[PDB]
Design a protein around this ligand. Structure first.
Ligand SMILES: Cc1cc2nc3c(=O)[nH]c(=O)nc-3n(C[C@H](O)[C@H](O)[C@H](O)COP(=O)(O)OP(=O)(O)OC[C@H]3O[C@@H](n4cnc5c(N)ncnc54)[C@H](O)[C@@H]3O)c2cc1C
Ligand SMILES: Cc1cc2nc3c(=O)[nH]c(=O)nc-3n(C[C@H](O)[C@H](O)[C@H](O)COP(=O)(O)OP(=O)(O)OC[C@H]3O[C@@H](n4cnc5c(N)ncnc54)[C@H](O)[C@@H]3O)c2cc1C
Lengths: 106, 106
């Protein structure tokens, strides 16, 4: 129900923004191509009917910015804010988008 | 640092298993290929170099089963258990894999 959608959404966003924060600063044409294809599949395969419906249209209306890490993670913050806007939720400050989602990795 | 990686990991698995449990029972050939492609990028783009390296090897050794929701969900559980075994963590019983992740299919 509403519960599941909320719990899954939170986990997904956490993974989503962390993934983008790791995208390279100088992506190659192939990497830019891969992120583009991943996003399309991410949207199409998202585990919630209405969510996928809305999200597929959003990414086509505002395609993922793949020129760089900053552009991609920022696009992620902007796209998530489009969902927030849609759900009447607060808009998140994107000023520390990379720092907010460190991979905690090497 | 390691606590962040673990948090990112938990969030990713939650999303991952739910996605597999929401895949169609009767997928079309195109949906099957999209899932195959998605999993390849998911492994390739995971937010941790070492994790990604090992996971890519795993999905190649154990390619995703896309014939149905159940096959895909079962595959996801086994693949996660391969990571568990790798990190010397306990094995997870896959007997109720669909239910555990709100397949909305019971
Ligand atoms: C691709 C996708 C599409 C979705 N579509 C819908 C839908 O159509 N209908 C519906 O009911 N639900 C939808 N959801 C669910 C929804 O977006 C929320 O995940 C959910 O309702 C839980 O809300 P929340 O308040 O806990 O914050 P979320 O929106 O889950 O919160 C993520 C957390 O990340 C942070 N955050 C918030 N905004 C941003 C941002 N802009 N950039 C970076 N971090 C941010 C904050 O710390 C916050 O607590 C979707 C989820 C995903 C992942
Ligand atoms: C693609 C991917 C690759 C990863 N690779 C590495 C790596 O190489 N090295 C490293 O240090 N970390 C890696 N991680 C992180 C790691 O697997 C864990 O997420 C993390 O250490 C935290 O573990 P946890 O014990 O809290 O449970 P996780 O293993 O995070 O648990 C999620 C939870 O899901 C359930 N669960 C457990 N096993 C299964 C299963 N088999 N099927 C369905 N549900 C299950 C349980 O409820 C458990 O609480 C990876 C994560 C992902 C998503």
């Amino acid at each position: 129900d509403d519960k599941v959608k909320k719990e899954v959404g939170r986990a997904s966003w956490k993974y989503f923004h962390t993934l983008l924060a790791r995208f390279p600063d100088e992506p190659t044409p192939e990497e830019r191509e891969k992120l583009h294809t991943f996003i399309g599949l991410y949207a199409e395969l998202y585990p919630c009917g209405e969510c996928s419906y809305h999200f597929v249209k959003l990414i086509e209306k505002y395609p993922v910015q793949t020129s760089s890490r900053t552009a991609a993670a920022m696009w992620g913050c902007h796209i998530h804010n489009k969902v927030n806007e849609y759900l009447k939720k607060d808009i998140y400050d994107c000023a520390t988008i990379l720092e907010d989602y460190d991979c905690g990795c090497s």
